[PDB]
């Protein structure tokens, strides 16, 4: 149903893109393999490491979760910045569930290391 | 018999599953915009960029323009490259018409 | 100005449509040629890699021609792209009126399926 | 451009697809790598081996060309089967100069190009 | 803006069509003119006559404003009926309007 | 710059959507509320300008509730727009398992088990 | 087949590279208006010969405009957009007599057609 | 129950059946472009414009710009105005040409024929 999300915004100028669209599409991730390690680097500016969680379902995909809430002040024009985030990522080389996963969140950037 | 129009649609659904780098370059950043005390605040979620590289300008035609430049080394075999190398964001201003960069979040204060 | 999302969407789909899904082909394949000659409607289809037994030809109750074929493909090694169709269903609505049952026959050579069906009003 | 070949056929039903489109879209390829060889498999019915030409570009892409002539008889309604095939394929695995092997059977074209390393 | 409203509901089935949708859509109007008088015909429902407001805020514009409050008892499964209506028809100086049995009618020179 | 056809299509549909099709409205009507109170399901719907005799409410063999109504209108003088719907046929899918209505002031209220 | 389909095919195109097929279906833009007990249709149809254009009044109450021409392409061609065969079918706003004195004059690429309204002297 | 998509298309199709005058101002004119004799020619169907009112200019970005303005006086009740009043077609040129290059354009029977010297041409 990802396509359905994009469609709702076809009328909109790039200034006006919805928050709901952003929740779906965020985050952008680059992911690569090096030395028996599968690394994912995602982009989540303005979030707290307590609110970020990562997991792998039995099906071979990697999952990312993040919550935040934002206080609304004054005359409001934009609600774009996403509160909730849920991202499922298909995995090309299935890492063992047992293998440890380490995530480091720095400078609005999330990095995840996964052993092969 | 079926129709071509349906088949195209089924295809686009497949296509839009995993978005390009270029896509995200065009959409980023999501912004919050409010008016408090005769000041306009634009709040942008940016994957970390060096502060000096990030630039903000007010356009002549009542627009706000947000650019930024990044360089990334694609070490090893790359499965995906979603992240945006470059950014151009044009933002219309609601009302008639000083930047701080913290935790990858850009907060722009505009006098009014 | 600000930019159009629709533009972005369009720009996105293009580069992606360079590589087409296996499903897409399953619907689109085969190409055929259809002509009337000697009171007979001949149709020729490109179906590479399906065995003769697996391919089926049926005359529909509606005035249409249906080609059905299925296959199983071994998938060794690291698969990067798998565009070619495993199972085919194709429906063609005939341009002229044809005899209802059983006269059409099929020939399959060089991966090419040839059907010859007798037109209506033909003379034996 | 490929999308423009697709968009020109939107209205039509599946029985009515243009030959130009099929020329643009044929063949469907199966690509995988094994035994230090990258194998391409394409569906290409109604062609002669002498007419089928395979070249490898300077850029990463691999190109398949095929041509044939057609002999229409009588009143024709459908003419969809493609006369000239030209398919440029970007290959993921690394391959400037290489030794390519191609065998055509039963409309099926099998091309084997050796990737760096292995065997 | 108006096309953006339509596109929001594209995923949804005809029953699931949102409230915000309906607020923008309502009312469907029929416009005609008799004897050099202009007449407007609009389908508004479940609105109190006092709450409804009509004026022309531009030289050539028609604005209809309408508001209501709805309190929902029990578990509510859907809420499609609109709270506030701000349709802005455009006129192709005194307007007389009586709203009865849903139908709201406006009379212009 | 040459411009884009798509940009031209979007602009074209947009100018036209301000005034919408009466046939579009017919699909859309009515906006309904569905709540459950007193072990009963209630529907409130907005169908202004339609006669009580014209209105029909039926229940499906399927789970769905179905509202049917109809009306007739004659337009006097030149008509600039005729957005009003004439042939409504709403259908609603039901959340709670379900085998009776009152209409006033262009509003329909329906009660079900 | 439909008008919508004709537009859709060109969505992935810039304005300066629009298909000829598209132009054949879309040409000509017309002005249509009733005045003086007559219904006037003004069409923009350049590069044609009057001998090639024909006007039909249909079984249904619609006006059909047909035109056709040949253009031999000289040299190395980069763009062939201009229409070869026009077949514009226009639905009339008002009922008109079919047994009617209709006047279609071509001048400077502009086709002006006049049609008597039913019920006018 | 029906879907919004099916509903939307039905609406979309309706809005396209009859086309705006603005629409045509975008799409007009159709052009034929060929190169021969080391010069580039653009021939365009531009029916019903005064020759004086048409302007042709070579852009800084190797593209061709056709500008046409005309005034139409409407009479009686009007049921359609598809005819474009203002035209600004911008055409990307497939071969480098001189910005400085002298240009000739001819207007006859509502067809605009424009010839433009290609880069590397000899006068
Ligand atoms: Cl979860
Ligand atoms: Cl700039
Ligand atoms: Cl079957
Ligand atoms: Cl070549
Ligand atoms: Cl007829
Ligand atoms: Cl005809
Ligand atoms: Cl030459
Ligand atoms: Cl310029
Ligand atoms: Cl200019």
UniProtKB/TrEMBL annotation, chain F:
List UniProt keywords, sorted A-Z: Calcium, Metal-binding, Stress response
List membrane-spanning regions.
Answer: none
A single Gene Ontology molecular function, please?
Answer: identical protein binding
Q: What CDD domains does the database record attribute to this sequence?
A: ACD_sHsps-like
Top-level taxon of the source organism = Archaea
Q: PROSITE patterns under this entry?
A: SHSP
Which residues bind Ca(2+) 3 per the record?
A: 72
Kindly name one Pfam family recorded for this protein. HSP20
What are the binding positions for Ca(2+) 2 in this chain? Answer: 19, 23
The family note in this entry says: Belongs to the small heat shock protein (HSP20) family.
User: What is the designated name of this protein?
Assistant: Heat shock protein Hsp20
Organism of origin is: Saccharolobus solfataricus (strain 98/2) (Sulfolobus solfataricus)
Give the organism's phylogenetic lineage. Archaea, Thermoproteota, Thermoprotei, Sulfolobales, Sulfolobaceae
From TrEMBL, chain H:
Binding residue positions for Ca(2+) 2: 18, 22
A GO MF annotation of the entry reads:
metal ion binding
SHSP domain boundaries: 22-123
UniProt xrefs under InterPro entries? A-crystallin/Hsp20_dom, HSP20-like_chaperone, Small_HSP
Amino acids binding Ca(2+) 1: 11
Binding-site positions, Ca(2+) 3: 71
User: What keywords were assigned to this record?
Assistant: Calcium, Metal-binding, Stress response
Q: Carries keyword Metal-binding?
A: yes
Report what the protein is called: Heat shock protein Hsp20
Please give the organism: Saccharolobus solfataricus (strain 98/2)
Classification from the root reads: Archaea, Thermoproteota, Thermoprotei, Sulfolobales, Sulfolobaceae
